[PDB]
Amino acid sequence: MNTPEHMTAVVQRYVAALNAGDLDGIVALFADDATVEDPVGSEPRSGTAAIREFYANSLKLPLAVELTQEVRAVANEAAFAFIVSFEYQGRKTVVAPIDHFRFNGAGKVVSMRALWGEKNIHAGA
């Protein structure tokens, strides 16, 4: 059963992939039938094809990503706090959300939810 270690490693591989603009790396962590809803409240993306599209779209700008707290993982689920930093209009922006992962028996993410809003968008000037 999905151990804390495996789930936490998946989270780190996800963060590392984002940081490395590694698209195949991001998609490989998801189940072929996985769902991605980012942000929470919007229509989720179903399937490898849609998820790949989502992450590609998301990597337009170079992203600096890092886990800001320890990873929370239990009963095939994980939650992590982190930051996504990038340049937008000459300004250094920082989005701080909280992601949630639902792993399947195979050990792959079958559902990802990204909860963040306007109050979570910060920028250095």
Place this chain on the structure above:
Amino acid sequence: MNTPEHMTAVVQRYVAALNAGDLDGIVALFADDATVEDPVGSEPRSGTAAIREFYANSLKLPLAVELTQEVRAVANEAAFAFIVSFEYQGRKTVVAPIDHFRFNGAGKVVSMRALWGEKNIHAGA
């Protein structure tokens, strides 16, 4: 509808109530049909009574609860990072989970979920 401001306000009143040992104030945040799953993977408690019993038991020992990061709020939902420190049998313990709040139309919480595992429990300090 739910503004991020309102949801955040509720998140803070929740923490404050735990620190104040205010069982009534805690319960008053939830809807009469709400559910509490703490921790994630456990049998969710449904209803006011079930919920009151839950926090009733949780307040056996004085709790020191603090938000450790900005609250994330959007589309009727909120998630927050925090810690729960307490003592028992001469031994200080800190649990650092991530909670998820789902609100109904009347601004009340209809669902809470606390995600924390063995790696999120730090004994001794």
